[PDB]
DNA sequence: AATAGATTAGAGCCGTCA
RNA sequence: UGACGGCUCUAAUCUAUUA
């Protein structure tokens, strides 16, 4: 006889059950309990009577609201105490009352007139109780070790929920960029272009350098806003080819690679904003950068309607891609952004609550599939015959280690 | 398609001997440390404040469970986890009278009425220091919503003592700091949260589910402050050195004068865990940047390796600077000229403004936490937020961000520096929680340098995080 | 020393007569509180500065010397470190006791 | 004094159950 | 200021070019 048979209430008392069990364990004593078993079953009867009449030792008995008048607590006391008779025991069952909530006045006729120990103001003086008890009669125990207890715990809540060896895919919010003009090329318009003419606001994306003009474009375009370009010599005009550039192999007095890199940059994001104009998209300017919105995509939430709403960047590092993020804008009837900036604020963080992974990854595809060009891919207008090409698809992620989502 | 690769939990150390992943499991299974007896702990504040202290230290000595025991271990009691006594019978109290709070709140200046607050709680805290036979392991100052909700320094009202920040907290704990008293600041909304209630009849601020994670946190952070190890790391290797540096501004002055602050992390040999701050703050003149000049770099290494040098009695076999921004050629060069000759220098940059989020295909569950995605040799991403399958639930609540790792300067191997940035996320001991999204020495640096930012009388400040924690 | 004389008066202890000097039942049975050397938190001083400066022949300066190396650890270690300490004893050699008279 | 890209710090609000 | 996480708003500085 080595066990200590602990009963207990299965669903209620397991919080307490578990902590006793444990600690027990821990101090070198060899326990019982039905909540330290997995694959039961048929296992319920036939075995528990037993080991409660031929290997229990001390029968401890968890006394609280939910144990009392329990048919299965019932039935093992009176089996204990069949047990307790058949043994020269009279300290066989010892109640340990944790309820406030069970006065000492309602206890069941099998354990009213039994002492016991008292847990309800604090455990750690209960544990004293119990092991100073069982120091005083002698219970059988080996010497205390608590790795045995960290290795058996493992045994149960570990394995059912560990890393797994699984290969998955991930989605990003990454798009490739897929093509780049052949040659970007300088137009000489020595003090032909006005001084003054805020390029910014030509048909095609330029950026002033020097004398010079940085597009991508051809070399009478843009013929509208400058009349006198006609009559322009077009061996002047430095061209540099992109892939060059781009590889890093490339740098000379008129310009760095690290200038022409940003320079490329500027105009992929002019080109994405120009299209994004084009697109008849609405437009937020946030504090640094410009969202998108659609006047599910669009929802409500009380009297506010939630936009999805993306930005787009584009970068050279680690590879061409142009990243999105992900926002939500609030409006009074789904046309008129609220200007409350404090109440935009508290809506997006109250809206974004119930969103989980597939909600946010499902809505970023959903908008971005629906700017697609054609097919597979969509394009950034650099010139009259000049386009960069852009994934519609974001880039994927592979990895050999997942869990088991044991809901 | 791109490949991730996975890096496994680091373990933290425990009494006995045994290893565990997580605080709470093996603070409730072994046990800490060191063997402290009990807290005697100072009590300054109201009359209601000294009741709501003793009633939530009646609170703690028993189990407090939360609603999910997997999701949230629970807490069986101050002695049954630390196994020392910090009960409501060890108390001094020093009472100080509302109507001298009240007074003193009115002067229509921030910075004046935080001064005359600050000054009413510390004259109590030092004289009592001085000049009696109490001992006490910590104060607890006790402190009323009125005087939270107007001493921010963005907080509007309904010369001398402008030399110092507009912030309660910060100018308390820094004004304290040649007195060396471990302290610590409670709302009165915190510890009784059940009474403080809106227009509507509810709390505030909901503690019903996780009173247990907020034992947890209060009860660790207590045992620190007395003097307490609660737990170590159990894989450090020999001859390594971590170095945190981060900056801050010293707004309120002519000159905007960045201030650098460092914290230092390394084995004691005695298989032990050295983990104090390295600071006398150094300054750069120019503002907005966030590079040291030769000479104050110069002294910071040397400072740092001649402590290294001390505690152990050789210098380290290698430095790891971590770092939120970038080195110069001026600033690693200045520190290459005090290095000793076998000695590895590796700068670090830890980023986190780059946009990057992976979404799983199926699942409303994020990324598993320790994956990795290797850009270069000298650069990558890590996932230091995402799923925990321990405890079946993510560190935080929409799908998280990675931080950028770059090897900015030395030579080193990117898959250990991820390892060794992963495990420094299991310290920080002024919290309870399964583990943090960022190094432990980027972050004590960080709360150094808010600290010693708030004053211009300091010198020569203590380095035990307890005095600034 | 003191770590040894710590754990020696948690005993009873008795004088040669009983009535002039009553006995000593022992520290935790007399105050009862708890005294032994488990709270202790050592602060070495290496004999090598206490024997440099105890020979300077100029009495207020090595006596100006010795608080000074004193305090300036103990102030250190209450400022500057988190562990909590009630009463600092300092343990000195007999040799400073007897040159610091004027 | 403007146009970019690229990098740094500071405040301040909201959620944690299910 | 019991934690942590995610957001949004507001400053700088550097680099190239133009005036
Ligand atoms: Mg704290």
Redesign the interface.
């Given at each position: 006889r080595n066990k200590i048979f602990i009963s207990h209430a299965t669903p209620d008392d397991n919080?307490?059950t578990r902590?006793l069990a444990?600690k027990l364990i821990?101090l070198g004593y060899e326990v019982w309990c039905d909540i330290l078993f997995l694959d039961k079953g048929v296992d319920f009867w036939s075995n528990i009577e037993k080991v409660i009449r031929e290997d229990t030792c001390k029968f401890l008995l968890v006394s609280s609201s939910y144990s009392n008048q329990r048919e299965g607590v019932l039935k093992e006391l009176a089996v204990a105490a069949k047990v307790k008779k058949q043994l020269k025991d009279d300290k066989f069952i010892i109640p340990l009352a944790i309820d406030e909530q069970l006065s000492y006045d309602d206890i069941n006729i099998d354990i009213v007139r039994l002492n016991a120990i008292d847990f309800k103001?604090?455990?750690?003086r209960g544990?004293k109780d119990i092991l100073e008890a069982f120091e005083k009669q002698k219970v059988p125990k080996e010497v205390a070790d608590?790795?045995k207890?960290?290795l058996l715990?493992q045994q149960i809540?570990?394995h059912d929920?560990?890393?797994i060896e699984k290969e998955?895919?991930?989605?990003?919010?990454?798009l490739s960029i897929l093509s780049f003009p052949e040659e970007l090329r300088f137009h000489e318009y020595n003090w032909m272009l006005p001084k003054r003419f805020d390029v910014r606001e030509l048909t095609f994306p330029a950026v002033r350098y020097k004398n010079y003009l940085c597009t991508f474009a051809w070399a009478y375009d843009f013929t509208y806003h400058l009349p006198k370009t006609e009559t322009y010599h077009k061996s002047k005009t430095i061209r540099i080819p992109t892939e060059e550039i781009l590889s890093g192999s490339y740098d000379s007095n008129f310009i760095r690679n690290a200038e022409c890199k940003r320079l490329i940059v500027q105009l992929l994001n002019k080109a994405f904003e120009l299209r994004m104009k084009d697109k008849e998209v609405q437009e937020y300017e946030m504090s640094n950068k410009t969202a998108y919105w659609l006047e599910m995509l669009v929802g409500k939430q009380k009297d506010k309607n939630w936009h999805f709403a993306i930005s787009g960047?584009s970068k050279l590092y680690?590879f061409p891609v142009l990243?999105?993020?992900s926002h939500i804008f609030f409006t009074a009837d789904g046309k008129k952004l609220i200007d409350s900036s404090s109440v935009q604020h508290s809506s997006r963080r109250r809206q974004?609550?119930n969103?989980?992974?597939?909600?946010?990854?499902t809505k970023?595809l959903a908008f971005i599939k629906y700017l697609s060009d054609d097919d597979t891919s969509f394009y950034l207008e650099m010139g009259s015959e000049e386009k960069v090409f852009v994934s519609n698809e974001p880039?994927?992620?592979?990895?050999?280690?997942?869990?088991?989502?044991?809901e | 398609?791109?490949?991730?690769?996975?890096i496994e939990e680091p373990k933290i150390l425990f009494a006995?001997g045994?290893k565990?992943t997580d605080a709470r499991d093996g603070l409730a299974?072994?046990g800490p440390l060191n063997?402290?007896?009990?807290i005697?702990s100072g009590v300054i504040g109201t009359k209601q404040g000294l009741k709501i202290f003793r009633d939530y230290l009646d609170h703690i000595?028993?189990?407090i469970?939360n609603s999910n025991?997997?999701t949230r271990p629970?807490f069986?009691?101050f002695?049954?986890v630390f196994d020392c006594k910090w009960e409501s019978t060890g108390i001094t109290f020093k009472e100080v009278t509302n109507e001298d709070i009240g007074k003193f709140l009115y002067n229509s200046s921030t910075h004046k009425r935080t001064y005359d607050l600050v000054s009413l709680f510390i004259d109590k805290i030092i004289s009592a220091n001085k000049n009696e036979d109490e001992?006490?392991?910590?104060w607890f100052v006790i402190v009323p919503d009125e005087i939270y909700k107007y001493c921010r320094p963005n907080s509007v009202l309904p010369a001398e003592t402008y030399n110092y920040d507009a912030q309660f907290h910060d100018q308390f704990k820094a004004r304290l700091?040649?007195?060396?008293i471990?302290t610590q600041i409670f709302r009165e909304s915190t510890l009784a949260w059940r009474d403080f209630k809106n227009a509507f009849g509810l709390p505030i601020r909901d503690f019903s589910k996780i009173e247990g994670h907020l034992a947890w946190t209060i009860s660790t952070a207590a045992f620190?402050?007395?003097?307490g190890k609660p737990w170590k790391l159990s894989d450090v290797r020999n001859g390594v050195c971590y170095l945190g540096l981060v900056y801050k501004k010293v707004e309120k002055s002519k000159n905007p004068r960045n201030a650098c602050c460092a914290a230092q992390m390394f084995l004691d040999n005695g298989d032990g865990t050295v983990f104090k701050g390295e600071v006398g703050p150094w300054y750069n003149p120019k503002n907005g940047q966030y590079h040291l000049e030769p000479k104050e770099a110069k002294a910071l290494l040397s400072q740092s390796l001649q402590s290294y040098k001390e505690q152990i009695g050789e210098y380290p076999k290698e430095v790891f600077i971590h770092a939120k921004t970038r080195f110069n050629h001026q600033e690693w060069d200045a520190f290459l000229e005090v290095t000793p000759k076998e000695t590895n220098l590796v700068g670090v940059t830890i980023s986190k403004t780059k946009?990057?989020?992976?979404?799983?295909?199926?699942?409303?569950?994020?990324?598993?936490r320790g994956?990795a995605?290797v850009?270069?040799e000298r650069?990558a991403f890590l996932w230091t937020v995402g799923?925990v399958?321990?405890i079946?639930t993510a560190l935080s609540?929409?799908?998280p961000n990675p931080l950028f790792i770059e090897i900015n300067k030395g030579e080193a191997d990117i898959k250990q520096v991820l390892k060794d940035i992963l495990s420094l996320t299991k310290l920080n001991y002024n919290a309870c929680i399964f583990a943090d999204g960022e190094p432990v020495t980027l972050r004590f640096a960080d709360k150094i340098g808010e600290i010693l930012t708030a004053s211009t009388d300091i010198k020569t400040?203590?380095?035990?995080?307890?005095?600034y924690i």
């Open positions: 919080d307490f902590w444990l821990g103001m604090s455990w750690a544990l608590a790795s207890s960290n715990y809540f570990l929920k560990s890393v998955e895919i991930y989605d990003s919010n990454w960047a680690p990243m999105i993020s974004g609550k969103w989980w992974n597939n909600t946010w990854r970023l880039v994927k992620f592979k990895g050999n280690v997942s869990y088991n989502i044991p | 398609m791109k490949e991730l690769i996975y006995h045994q565990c299974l072994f063997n402290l007896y009990g005697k000595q028993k189990p469970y025991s997997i629970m069986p009691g002695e049954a001992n006490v392991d910590v700091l040649k007195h060396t471990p620190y402050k007395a003097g946009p990057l989020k992976l979404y799983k295909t199926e699942g409303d569950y994020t990324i598993l994956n995605y850009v270069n650069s799923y399958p321990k079946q609540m929409e799908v400040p203590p380095l035990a995080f307890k005095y």
